[PDB]
Paper text:
The RELATIVE OF EARLY FLOWERING 6 protein (REF6/JMJ12), a Jumonji C (JmjC) domain—containing histone demethylase, specifically demethylates H3K27me3 at its target loci. ZnF domains adopt the canonical ββα fold, with a small β-sheet packed against a helix in a globular structure, and wrap more than one turn of the DNA double helix, interacting with DNA in the major groove with a classic α-helix. Structural analysis demonstrates that CHG methylation is unfavorable for REF6 binding and attenuates REF6-binding affinity.
Although the overall structures of the REF6 ZnF domains were similar between complexes with methylated or unmethylated DNA oligos, there are minor conformational changes when DNA strands carrying the methyl-group. Further analysis by isothermal titration calorimetry (ITC) between REF6-ZnFs and the DNA probes with or without 5mCs revealed that 5mCs lead to great reduction in the binding affinity to the CTCTGYTY motif. In combination with EMSA assay, the biochemical and structural studies demonstrated that DNA methylation at the CTCTGYTY-motif, especially at the CTG core, is sufficient to abolish (or severely attenuate) the affinity of REF6-ZnF for this DNA sequence.
Residue numbers in the entry: 1265 to 1353
DNA sequence: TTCTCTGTTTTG
DNA sequence: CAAAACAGAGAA
């Protein structure tokens, strides 16, 4: 199997490629930058970025497809917890 | 709660 | 295939 060599997280990963990508966890480097003017937030992960951006735009893209629901959510986490505790879609 | 992290799945 | 998106975990 695929295992992180860093003593302290001997975590196991489905792929080797993601074993490489995983290493950013252990660096303090934060390559990805917020694109919003004068915001100094940084990330290691694009998905963090993507979602962070909607705090600036206030967008609420996740829209419940279930009839007589129609709540919306900014982040995926909220939508997944939601259908978990409702069973919609 | 609101928001970020991260491992795996899905997408194009 | 890799980039995007998911799902649920983790911070605050
Ligand atoms: Zn590790
Ligand atoms: Zn920002
Ligand atoms: Zn719903």
């Amino acid at each position: 199997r695929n295992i992180c060599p860093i003593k302290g997280c001997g975590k196991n990963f489905f792929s080797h490629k993601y074993l490489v990508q995983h290493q950013r966890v252990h660096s303090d480097d934060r390559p990805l930058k917020c694109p919003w003017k004068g915001c100094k937030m940084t990330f290691k992960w694009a998905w963090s970025r993507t979602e962070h951006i909607r705090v600036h735009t206030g967008a609420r893209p996740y829209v419940c497809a279930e009839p007589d629901c129609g709540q919306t959510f900014r982040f995926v986490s909220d939508f997944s917890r939601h259908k978990r505790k409702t069973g919609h879609s």
